[PDB]
């Protein structure tokens, strides 16, 4: 025994499966419209981004 | 119903189709040339609809390929598709065929040690016997490593694209600019391939649309005889930092050279290395490690190739 | 609160008078305060946002 | 299309909205080329902090890594920027605070804030960060500050080591002031971290003593025939007192085929000094409009 004791500190993770409750009509959403934007044209393929 | 709205935004933002003019039938050549000329003439008038047709054009660019014609004694049939190419143009009066130096071939012209590059010497011992047929063409692998003019002769080109290897003469096609695609019609992204033994990766740091790949050709002398060395680098740090990072890699070489040349030191001996710029790689594309008969070879996706002059560093 | 300029896409009206005379020199040495030029790629109605 | 939207994760106030409103159309460097980005990447003062000493080389050395983007829109919840492709025609507006007149066919380069940090630093206290702006400057002053900033870190090391070496009054006027046509400007270099400004100076001393070992002797002997005979308009730094070391190399005779091998080797180390006097990216302006202050340049980094 050297002349000092010591304390240890750890951390530990837990995969907790949760339960969410959320009351009626609290948030109000505003949905836009999907808009397509072409951004690349190659010789092989054309990409897009919605 | 909302997917039918997206079926219009796709079909209104596509590029216009490339015109196909049949040159084999007679009355289908008339109907195809006419729709060039009736449709170009409405892309020139000053009305609003004719200016509407001139805005849909999508100018995607194509790479510029080189056609090289090599001896099969100086280019191995076993080369991965995407090996980098160095040209060599010491003499001009012949002008018959060309020399192309892959990095696993230039490893034999240097004579550098097999403890610096452990794996690629065994593969360069089976693709070439003793490095003779590579070095039968240069009578100055001892007078271009003294006077320091070897880097002035190499011009970097680009990766392999197509090689029709024959018994005597090998026909090699490269890609100099742009993203390297196979020229043949199933166009595949033939990216640049380097062995993991040659490439030395340098790297909170920001990343752009760019991480370049540099080529350093370093002069040294082993066994008190001249013998160069070549390494590849990869960092997106800007040209002021990489020259400071390469000199850290070669601290043990600059010290152990000038000790060997302490007493005699001619003015031609002072030039040490040179850094080229081979091309850029976009960030978000990591290289994939790949083994070939075994040789650990990186492969890059979407390596678009550029070319820089050799700049001496020391 | 001072009255400030704004580039919102107003429905501008049409006058019988011309306004063009001496404007290029009057912009240089200020005939009138609080102006803003718009050259070629930016001389348009700005997009409406709110 | 190409754009960058940048969130302001808390909020922002009405004073710093008017501060970000005056700074519209200015080039800032930001971290990553993602469409979505937070506040921590946009500052050039993520390395240039207030409680720590700045490092104007390392700040500038950080600037050739980043992507560079132009502001378009300032919103109270976001900042929408437009980026700069590495080979792209674009437009840059002369907002920047020490007004230097540009023209068509000029040569721009991006520099750190080297005259007033307090002008460039506006603090965003609603998020616990400050966004710091560079200054785009034609390369005639881009290089000339880096010539001057390295002269400071030579002679400040001598004076801080021993104050009897350097007189302080001549030190302040010469090592800090940048000479420009018409005006002389005072650098903001008083409390810096010179530890990466000496590694640049430790790379000059490798290239420079090589250039002293192989001076061609015909150019030395042309000085001794010019500093005491003729009065040329740019040799007047050298008075009639020639440096004594030049005359002490005159003891050998001339030789043309031994100065070709000195002119050639000295030539390829002059091409190496473009790795130590580097600016950031370059902006080749090909059109400019002085009444709108709007340049239209070509971006090419490295």
XYZ file of C-alpha atoms in Angstrom:
716
model
C 0.000 0.000 0.000
C 1.519 3.351 -0.992
C 0.536 6.207 1.262
C -2.629 7.290 -0.564
C -5.960 5.744 -1.482
C -7.719 6.654 -4.701
C -11.182 6.966 -6.193
C -12.181 5.688 -9.617
C -14.657 7.283 -12.052
C -16.250 5.465 -15.011
C -18.966 6.017 -17.603
C -21.389 3.409 -18.908
C -23.879 3.507 -21.768
C -27.370 1.992 -21.801
C -29.505 1.288 -24.864
C -32.765 2.542 -23.372
C -35.968 2.040 -25.335
C -38.143 5.071 -24.604
C -41.798 6.074 -24.453
C -42.762 9.434 -25.921
C -46.109 10.997 -25.092
C -47.197 14.116 -26.959
C -50.551 15.790 -26.411
C -53.218 16.673 -28.952
C -52.688 19.414 -31.529
C -49.745 21.141 -29.828
C -47.337 21.680 -32.719
C -48.684 23.033 -36.001
C -46.880 22.053 -39.183
C -46.427 23.959 -42.436
C -45.666 21.678 -45.382
C -44.279 23.314 -48.509
C -43.968 21.788 -51.943
C -41.258 19.468 -53.313
C -39.058 21.303 -55.815
C -36.647 19.530 -58.163
C -33.232 21.106 -58.812
C -30.858 19.623 -61.385
C -27.295 20.118 -60.319
C -25.031 17.745 -62.288
C -24.923 16.449 -65.861
C -22.236 13.898 -66.706
C -21.639 11.725 -69.735
C -22.701 8.686 -67.687
C -25.760 9.860 -65.736
C -27.777 12.879 -64.623
C -28.379 13.570 -60.940
C -31.068 15.658 -59.267
C -31.927 16.897 -55.796
C -35.469 17.244 -54.472
C -51.183 12.920 -57.749
C -48.177 14.838 -56.455
C -45.760 12.495 -58.239
C -47.265 13.637 -61.541
C -46.166 17.173 -60.675
C -42.613 15.871 -60.230
C -42.885 14.149 -63.606
C -42.964 17.618 -65.189
C -40.060 19.142 -63.257
C -37.885 16.211 -64.314
C -38.964 16.281 -67.978
C -38.508 20.064 -68.164
C -35.046 20.180 -66.603
C -33.404 17.410 -68.641
C -30.752 18.337 -71.218
C -31.870 18.290 -74.858
C -31.276 14.971 -76.629
C -28.269 14.604 -78.895
C -29.285 14.466 -82.551
C -28.906 11.093 -84.275
C -28.408 11.363 -88.038
C -28.459 8.011 -89.826
C -25.743 7.773 -92.481
C -26.765 4.360 -93.869
C -30.260 4.944 -95.241
C -31.223 7.606 -97.744
C -34.569 9.150 -96.748
C -33.646 8.909 -93.058
C -30.597 11.099 -93.667
C -32.879 13.795 -95.085
C -35.197 13.791 -92.057
C -32.259 13.989 -89.641
C -30.189 16.782 -91.165
C -33.343 18.890 -91.582
C -34.070 18.775 -87.842
C -30.617 20.118 -87.141
C -31.165 23.061 -89.443
C -34.808 23.760 -88.562
C -33.907 23.676 -84.858
C -30.644 25.616 -84.904
C -32.297 28.431 -86.883
C -34.694 28.947 -83.951
C -31.786 29.218 -81.486
C -30.495 32.416 -83.089
C -33.507 34.737 -83.549
C -34.045 37.604 -81.064
C -37.527 36.668 -79.829
C -38.264 35.377 -76.329
C -39.027 31.781 -77.290
C -35.834 31.535 -79.328
C -33.940 32.823 -76.309
C -35.851 30.222 -74.269
C -34.361 27.448 -76.430
C -30.790 28.730 -76.015
C -30.830 28.479 -72.207
C -31.470 24.723 -71.925
C -27.987 23.800 -73.214
C -25.816 21.767 -70.824
C -22.077 22.076 -71.689
C -20.432 19.055 -70.081
C -16.771 18.722 -71.051
C -14.860 15.650 -72.197
C -11.278 14.596 -71.380
C -8.413 14.751 -73.871
C -6.823 11.353 -74.499
C -3.268 10.605 -75.602
C -2.198 7.848 -77.998
C 1.118 6.263 -77.031
C 2.973 3.472 -78.798
C 5.373 1.620 -76.505
C 7.816 -1.271 -76.691
C 6.541 -4.337 -74.846
C 10.004 -4.855 -73.325
C 9.644 -1.575 -71.380
C 5.961 -1.925 -70.419
C 4.735 -4.985 -68.552
C 1.506 -6.741 -69.571
C 0.656 -7.022 -65.865
C -0.106 -3.407 -65.002
C -3.282 -2.358 -63.168
C -5.665 -0.337 -65.305
C -5.108 3.146 -63.926
C -1.354 3.119 -63.472
C 0.221 6.550 -63.783
C 2.389 7.396 -66.804
C 5.592 9.394 -67.172
C 6.950 10.169 -70.616
C 10.652 10.437 -71.410
C 11.972 12.544 -74.296
C 15.774 12.678 -74.111
C 16.386 12.330 -77.866
C 14.226 13.298 -80.823
C 15.901 12.155 -84.057
C 14.469 8.639 -83.877
C 10.800 9.595 -83.300
C 9.702 5.994 -83.895
C 8.318 4.819 -80.523
C 7.831 6.196 -77.034
C 8.953 5.417 -73.486
C 6.325 5.329 -70.731
C 7.507 4.954 -67.138
C 5.049 3.449 -64.688
C 6.132 3.875 -61.030
C 6.783 0.131 -60.732
C 9.087 0.435 -63.761
C 10.898 3.596 -62.626
C 11.619 1.763 -59.357
C 14.143 -0.313 -61.354
C 15.831 2.600 -63.157
C 16.591 4.286 -59.835
C 18.127 1.358 -58.005
C 16.643 2.484 -54.699
C 16.583 0.106 -51.755
C 14.106 -2.714 -51.189
C 13.900 -1.837 -47.487
C 12.417 1.585 -48.244
C 9.821 -0.028 -50.529
C 9.400 -3.619 -49.284
C 6.503 -5.002 -51.322
C 6.952 -3.344 -54.728
C 10.460 -4.743 -55.246
C 9.189 -8.331 -55.400
C 6.551 -7.320 -57.946
C 9.225 -5.402 -59.876
C 11.342 -8.561 -59.730
C 8.760 -10.639 -61.574
C 7.539 -8.076 -64.149
C 11.151 -7.227 -65.022
C 14.165 -9.489 -64.679
C 17.019 -7.170 -63.702
C 15.898 -3.769 -64.998
C 18.097 -4.131 -68.076
C 15.496 -3.740 -70.828
C 14.174 -0.622 -69.136
C 17.714 0.799 -68.923
C 19.034 -0.364 -72.304
C 17.616 2.809 -73.867
C 19.130 5.400 -71.513
C 22.956 5.523 -71.564
C 22.738 8.287 -68.935
C 21.336 6.798 -65.742
C 24.654 7.838 -64.182
C 25.034 11.287 -65.783
C 21.448 12.472 -65.307
C 21.603 11.670 -61.591
C 24.821 13.664 -61.161
C 23.966 16.742 -63.231
C 20.382 16.678 -61.956
C 18.467 16.772 -65.247
C 16.230 13.719 -64.921
C 13.173 15.627 -63.683
C 13.531 18.056 -66.601
C 12.892 15.174 -69.028
C 9.810 13.560 -67.472
C 6.445 15.036 -68.426
C 3.544 13.503 -66.459
C 0.611 12.377 -68.560
C -2.159 10.567 -66.718
C -3.549 7.156 -65.819
C -3.945 4.141 -68.065
C -7.216 3.880 -69.969
C -6.663 1.291 -72.696
C -3.703 -0.950 -73.515
C -3.747 -3.398 -76.427
C -0.700 -5.387 -75.380
C 1.019 -7.313 -78.173
C 4.172 -9.420 -78.260
C 6.558 -6.731 -79.539
C 4.831 -3.313 -79.404
C 2.258 -2.208 -76.812
C -0.304 0.470 -77.746
C -1.285 2.515 -74.670
C -4.041 5.140 -74.345
C -4.018 7.627 -71.445
C -6.276 10.406 -70.141
C -4.510 13.741 -69.706
C -7.223 16.198 -68.662
C -10.503 15.615 -66.884
C -12.010 12.586 -65.209
C -10.470 9.458 -66.671
C -13.142 7.462 -68.479
C -12.657 4.521 -70.794
C -12.885 5.893 -74.331
C -14.893 2.858 -75.481
C -18.631 3.183 -75.358
C -19.392 1.359 -72.078
C -17.639 4.268 -70.366
C -16.331 3.212 -66.955
C -14.549 5.400 -64.428
C -10.991 4.094 -64.728
C -9.533 5.880 -61.729
C -5.886 6.307 -60.894
C -4.311 3.381 -59.033
C -1.190 3.648 -56.867
C 0.476 1.055 -54.638
C 0.191 1.767 -50.918
C 3.984 1.444 -50.625
C 4.726 4.530 -52.740
C 1.989 6.851 -51.463
C 2.665 8.745 -48.227
C -0.490 10.353 -46.847
C 0.162 13.576 -44.951
C -3.061 13.881 -42.932
C -9.443 20.099 -37.140
C -8.653 20.847 -40.784
C -11.022 22.198 -43.451
C -11.581 20.384 -46.727
C -12.618 21.918 -50.035
C -13.644 20.308 -53.306
C -10.045 19.199 -53.614
C -7.237 17.075 -52.284
C -4.302 17.061 -54.676
C -1.726 14.359 -55.379
C 1.913 15.392 -55.764
C 4.914 13.569 -57.216
C 8.324 14.088 -55.628
C 11.437 12.816 -57.395
C 14.309 12.897 -54.917
C 17.972 12.542 -55.850
C 20.248 10.614 -53.506
C 23.258 8.281 -53.675
C 23.312 4.733 -52.305
C 26.480 2.579 -52.089
C 28.437 5.737 -53.083
C 26.815 5.621 -56.546
C 23.993 7.885 -57.805
C 20.452 6.555 -57.370
C 17.272 8.617 -57.162
C 13.997 7.945 -55.329
C 10.344 8.721 -56.046
C 7.439 9.041 -53.612
C 3.829 10.174 -53.930
C 2.049 12.543 -51.568
C -1.574 13.394 -50.849
C -2.787 16.424 -48.883
C -5.177 19.314 -49.355
C -3.053 21.777 -47.415
C -2.010 24.257 -50.095
C 1.379 24.533 -51.761
C 3.011 26.572 -48.982
C 2.456 23.846 -46.384
C 3.273 20.727 -48.396
C 6.776 21.960 -49.275
C 7.245 22.402 -45.524
C 5.864 18.879 -44.963
C 8.034 17.190 -47.619
C 11.252 18.580 -46.102
C 10.321 16.964 -42.782
C 10.014 13.612 -44.555
C 13.483 13.969 -46.123
C 15.468 15.297 -43.165
C 17.285 11.962 -42.787
C 18.198 11.973 -46.502
C 19.597 15.513 -46.791
C 21.811 14.876 -43.749
C 23.128 11.506 -44.932
C 23.780 12.779 -48.458
C 25.993 15.772 -47.697
C 28.021 13.702 -45.240
C 28.859 11.379 -48.151
C 29.595 14.454 -50.294
C 31.387 16.407 -47.552
C 34.775 16.741 -49.235
C 33.886 16.813 -52.925
C 30.792 18.889 -53.665
C 30.364 20.127 -57.219
C 27.791 22.737 -58.202
C 25.769 20.217 -60.236
C 25.365 18.104 -57.074
C 23.283 20.690 -55.186
C 19.892 20.094 -56.843
C 17.903 17.658 -54.716
C 14.257 17.148 -55.647
C 11.298 18.400 -57.634
C 7.548 18.390 -56.932
C 4.933 18.005 -59.648
C 1.151 18.243 -59.326
C -0.556 15.193 -60.789
C -4.242 15.949 -60.289
C -7.041 16.534 -57.834
C -9.354 14.223 -55.909
C -12.722 15.481 -54.614
C -13.250 15.126 -50.899
C -16.041 12.641 -49.893
C -14.292 10.010 -52.101
C -12.058 7.787 -49.966
C -9.597 5.454 -51.726
C -10.365 1.731 -51.704
C -7.587 -0.674 -50.736
C -7.147 -3.473 -53.251
C -4.703 -6.367 -53.607
C -3.289 -7.655 -56.902
C -0.893 -10.530 -57.613
C -0.017 -9.644 -53.480
C 0.354 -5.886 -53.985
C -1.638 -3.409 -51.842
C -2.930 -0.907 -54.404
C -5.132 2.098 -53.685
C -7.787 2.993 -56.238
C -9.249 6.495 -56.493
C -12.706 7.362 -57.757
C -13.199 10.492 -59.903
C -9.510 11.437 -60.070
C -9.546 14.312 -62.558
C -6.007 14.827 -63.788
C -4.033 18.046 -64.200
C -0.365 18.771 -64.837
C 2.146 21.065 -63.192
C 5.762 21.933 -63.942
C 8.573 20.468 -61.881
C 9.693 22.957 -59.225
C 12.970 22.306 -57.410
C 12.818 22.143 -53.616
C 15.594 21.872 -51.027
C -37.249 56.847 -37.881
C -35.889 58.030 -41.215
C -37.505 57.069 -44.508
C -35.321 54.551 -46.323
C -35.039 53.252 -49.876
C -36.220 49.749 -50.747
C -35.892 47.665 -53.912
C -39.155 45.733 -53.585
C -40.937 44.828 -56.878
C -43.417 47.693 -56.876
C -45.865 48.182 -59.772
C -44.162 51.298 -61.087
C -46.217 53.874 -62.983
C -45.517 55.589 -66.299
C -45.078 59.347 -66.667
C -45.340 61.583 -69.731
C -42.130 63.349 -68.719
C -38.642 62.076 -69.339
C -36.271 61.863 -66.398
C -33.061 60.926 -68.188
C -31.444 64.334 -68.670
C -28.237 64.891 -66.610
C -28.696 61.755 -64.425
C -25.235 60.222 -64.971
C -23.540 63.445 -63.871
C -26.089 64.058 -61.092
C -25.287 60.668 -59.567
C -21.602 61.622 -59.362
C -21.994 64.923 -57.501
C -25.176 64.409 -55.534
C -28.198 66.226 -56.885
C -30.339 64.071 -54.620
C -29.592 61.914 -51.602
C -30.335 58.195 -51.176
C -29.986 56.634 -54.613
C -28.789 53.237 -55.800
C -27.491 52.172 -59.186
C -28.254 48.799 -60.712
C -26.068 47.540 -63.546
C -26.853 44.802 -65.983
C -27.101 41.501 -64.126
C -28.924 43.131 -61.194
C -31.360 45.541 -62.895
C -34.607 43.634 -62.352
C -37.485 43.157 -59.951
C -36.142 41.446 -56.855
C -37.831 38.256 -55.738
C -40.713 38.768 -53.328
C -40.114 37.505 -49.802
C -41.935 38.256 -46.590
C -27.106 25.437 -58.583
C -24.606 25.811 -55.748
C -25.279 27.411 -52.370
C -24.533 27.105 -48.665
C -27.150 27.614 -45.949
C -25.703 28.239 -42.480
C -27.807 27.906 -39.350
C -27.833 30.288 -36.404
C -28.724 27.728 -33.778
C -29.861 30.069 -31.017
C -31.130 33.420 -32.420
C -29.596 36.769 -33.304
C -30.355 40.309 -32.193
C -31.204 43.549 -34.011
C -27.817 45.241 -33.573
C -25.785 42.356 -34.999
C -28.317 41.978 -37.811
C -27.434 45.544 -38.801
C -23.765 44.632 -38.325
C -24.104 41.622 -40.636
C -26.153 43.778 -43.021
C -23.276 46.175 -43.739
C -20.963 43.196 -44.352
C -23.019 41.757 -47.212
C -21.312 40.604 -50.389
C -18.013 39.957 -48.594
C -15.890 36.847 -49.092
C -15.431 34.723 -46.019
C -13.688 31.355 -45.780
C -15.702 28.533 -44.259
C -14.861 24.993 -43.226
C -16.550 22.283 -45.285
C -18.246 22.130 -48.682
C -21.558 20.852 -47.313
C -24.949 22.353 -48.079
C -25.680 22.439 -44.339
C -23.237 24.151 -41.993
C -23.142 25.503 -38.447
C -21.534 28.646 -37.033
C -18.198 27.099 -35.965
C -16.778 26.741 -39.496
C -17.393 30.221 -40.942
C -15.053 32.171 -38.687
C -11.534 32.951 -39.737
C -11.176 33.673 -36.011
C -11.691 30.096 -34.950
C -7.886 30.243 -34.965
C -7.717 34.053 -34.415
C -9.079 34.362 -30.879
C -9.044 37.262 -28.434
C -7.784 35.618 -25.235
C -4.969 33.883 -27.138
C -2.231 35.417 -29.240
C -2.941 35.382 -32.995
C -0.549 33.855 -35.513
C -0.798 35.878 -38.727
C 1.231 33.368 -40.713
C -0.781 30.391 -39.400
C -4.003 32.384 -39.887
C -2.943 33.016 -43.483
C -1.626 29.451 -43.715
C -5.142 28.335 -42.713
C -6.621 30.415 -45.535
C -5.229 28.390 -48.462
C -6.959 25.276 -47.084
C -10.515 26.561 -46.850
C -13.271 26.946 -49.370
C -14.224 30.566 -49.974
C -17.785 31.824 -50.175
C -19.638 35.075 -50.823
C -22.554 36.187 -48.666
C -25.892 36.886 -50.296
C -28.570 36.975 -47.592
C -28.623 37.760 -43.865
C -31.614 36.323 -42.000
C -32.284 36.293 -38.230
C -32.275 32.477 -38.226
C -29.768 31.701 -41.000
C -27.019 33.004 -43.287
C -27.311 31.878 -46.913
C -23.962 31.989 -48.716
C -22.906 31.170 -52.260
C -19.681 29.271 -52.820
C -16.836 29.492 -55.347
C -15.943 26.573 -57.611
C -12.176 26.119 -58.216
C -12.479 27.150 -61.895
C -15.426 29.508 -62.078
C -16.361 32.935 -63.383
C -17.971 34.934 -60.579
C -18.518 38.438 -59.184
C -16.856 40.125 -56.205
C -17.893 43.498 -54.795
C -15.346 45.976 -53.411
C -16.739 46.362 -49.892
C -13.403 46.142 -48.119
C -12.428 48.816 -45.682
C -8.957 50.182 -46.649
C -10.126 51.367 -50.051
C -7.659 50.476 -52.800
C -8.751 51.208 -56.362
C -8.958 48.188 -58.651
C -9.283 48.077 -62.428
C -9.766 45.508 -65.158
C -6.788 43.145 -65.563
C -5.668 43.193 -61.943
C -4.496 40.337 -59.737
C -6.235 39.757 -56.411
C -5.370 37.550 -53.451
C -7.012 36.992 -50.076
C -5.168 38.173 -46.954
C -5.861 37.928 -43.201
C -7.003 41.068 -41.341
C -3.626 42.761 -41.040
C -4.457 46.418 -40.325
C -7.513 46.333 -38.030
C -8.753 43.157 -36.368
C -11.410 45.180 -34.523
C -12.985 46.248 -37.826
C -13.112 42.675 -39.149
C -14.158 41.022 -35.866
C -17.858 41.453 -35.183
C -18.964 39.310 -32.261
C -22.121 37.168 -32.224
C -22.841 36.986 -28.501
C -26.171 35.202 -29.008
C -24.268 32.051 -30.044
C -20.924 32.450 -28.249
C -18.780 32.969 -31.342
C -17.303 35.758 -33.448
C -17.167 35.705 -37.247
C -13.954 37.173 -38.679
C -13.548 38.457 -42.263
C -10.488 38.533 -44.514
C -9.606 41.297 -46.960
C -9.111 40.857 -50.705
C -6.195 42.958 -51.902
C -4.272 43.227 -55.208
C -1.026 41.258 -55.093
C 1.185 44.367 -55.204
C 0.179 44.757 -51.559
C -0.417 41.044 -51.043
C 3.292 40.309 -51.284
C 4.470 43.627 -49.801
C 2.842 42.922 -46.444
C 4.420 39.453 -46.302
C 7.737 41.099 -47.118
C 7.127 43.460 -44.181
C 5.661 40.951 -41.713
C 8.735 38.725 -41.952
C 11.090 41.687 -41.469
C 9.264 42.373 -38.192
C 9.780 38.833 -36.888
C 13.499 39.064 -37.665
C 14.140 42.296 -35.794
C 11.617 41.796 -32.988
C 13.549 38.657 -32.068
C 16.755 40.702 -31.836
C 15.212 43.461 -29.709
C 13.372 41.108 -27.342
C 16.554 39.095 -26.869
C 18.678 42.125 -26.019
C 17.368 45.718 -26.118
C 20.871 47.157 -26.481
C 21.088 45.662 -29.972
C 18.243 47.628 -31.594
C 17.153 51.204 -30.964
C 13.421 51.056 -30.284
C 12.305 54.272 -32.005
C 13.753 53.294 -35.385
C 12.357 49.793 -34.840
C 8.714 50.875 -34.645
C 8.577 53.127 -37.711
C 10.430 50.782 -40.055
C 9.314 47.271 -39.127
C 5.612 48.014 -38.696
C 4.799 50.557 -41.404
C 3.991 49.181 -44.866
C 5.089 51.505 -47.662
C 2.456 51.993 -50.370
C 2.058 54.654 -53.073
C 0.786 57.810 -51.363
C 0.040 56.215 -47.987
C 1.911 54.305 -45.298
C -0.085 51.850 -43.208
C 0.447 50.561 -39.676
C 0.218 46.799 -39.217
C -1.737 45.283 -36.329
C 1.265 43.329 -35.041
C 1.893 44.043 -31.361
C 1.117 40.805 -29.462
C 1.425 37.794 -31.767
C 2.534 34.158 -31.649
C 5.631 34.132 -33.895
C 6.289 30.399 -33.553
C 5.158 29.564 -37.102
C 6.531 32.825 -38.499
C 10.027 31.577 -37.641
C 9.613 28.241 -39.431
C 9.096 30.280 -42.604
C 12.259 32.178 -41.680
C 13.957 28.843 -40.932
C 13.174 27.899 -44.544
C 14.679 31.072 -46.027
C 18.031 30.302 -44.378
C 18.237 27.068 -46.377
C 17.527 28.695 -49.738
C 19.460 31.871 -49.045
C 22.897 30.543 -48.095
C 22.767 28.291 -51.155
C 22.246 31.472 -53.188
C 25.276 32.996 -51.431
C 27.487 29.983 -52.180
C 27.040 30.126 -55.974
C 26.820 33.792 -56.917
C 28.130 34.192 -60.495
C 31.278 36.286 -60.328
C 30.517 38.368 -63.419
C 27.551 39.919 -61.631
C 29.727 40.679 -58.595
C 32.336 42.400 -60.782
C 29.633 44.464 -62.487
C 28.710 45.939 -59.090
C 32.251 47.178 -58.419
C 32.121 48.783 -61.878
C 28.780 50.437 -61.044
C 28.656 51.493 -57.385
C 31.655 53.846 -57.637
C 31.606 54.870 -61.321
C 28.009 55.607 -62.323
C 24.966 56.976 -60.501
C 22.046 54.727 -61.549
C 18.579 55.514 -60.088
C 18.119 52.197 -58.231
C 21.667 51.476 -57.037
C 21.582 54.496 -54.697
C 21.061 52.233 -51.694
C 24.665 51.200 -52.341
C 26.689 54.382 -51.972
C 30.352 54.775 -52.890
C 31.079 52.468 -49.949
C 30.750 49.063 -51.631
C 30.287 46.158 -49.179
C 33.724 44.835 -48.297
C 32.765 41.176 -48.806
C 32.074 41.774 -52.520
C 35.650 42.941 -53.092
C 37.015 39.941 -51.158
C 35.497 37.523 -53.711
C 37.185 39.383 -56.623
C 40.440 37.438 -56.000
C 39.612 34.833 -58.659
C 39.460 35.462 -62.394
C 36.465 35.254 -64.714
C 35.422 32.036 -66.435
C 32.413 31.823 -68.756
C 31.834 28.007 -68.765
C 31.984 27.985 -64.942
C 29.375 30.747 -64.611
C 26.894 29.035 -66.918
C 26.731 26.261 -64.313
C 26.253 28.964 -61.667
C 23.646 30.979 -63.572
C 21.665 27.795 -64.254
C 21.702 26.405 -60.711
C 20.908 29.810 -59.156
C 18.023 30.036 -61.639
C 16.320 26.905 -60.279
C 16.496 28.074 -56.672
C 14.879 31.372 -57.600
C 12.016 29.243 -58.897
C 11.856 27.658 -55.425
C 11.059 30.912 -53.607
C 7.474 30.726 -54.889
C 6.932 28.166 -52.112
C 7.749 30.656 -49.344
C 6.182 33.873 -50.685
C 2.804 32.269 -51.374
C -0.454 34.111 -51.043
C -3.785 32.318 -50.908
C -6.036 31.777 -53.903
C -6.004 34.082 -56.906
C -8.800 36.093 -58.541
C -7.987 37.233 -62.092
C -10.293 40.223 -62.586
C -11.255 40.732 -66.228
C -13.905 43.463 -65.784
C -14.527 46.194 -63.219
C -17.106 48.960 -62.732
C -15.940 51.842 -60.557
C -19.364 53.419 -59.915
C -20.795 50.157 -58.520
C -17.512 48.715 -57.099
C -18.261 45.326 -58.684
C -15.430 43.211 -60.062
C -16.009 40.059 -62.091
C -13.058 37.721 -61.674
C -11.958 34.112 -62.214
C -11.261 31.943 -59.168
C -8.305 29.569 -59.221
C -6.848 28.371 -55.899
C -3.279 27.299 -55.045
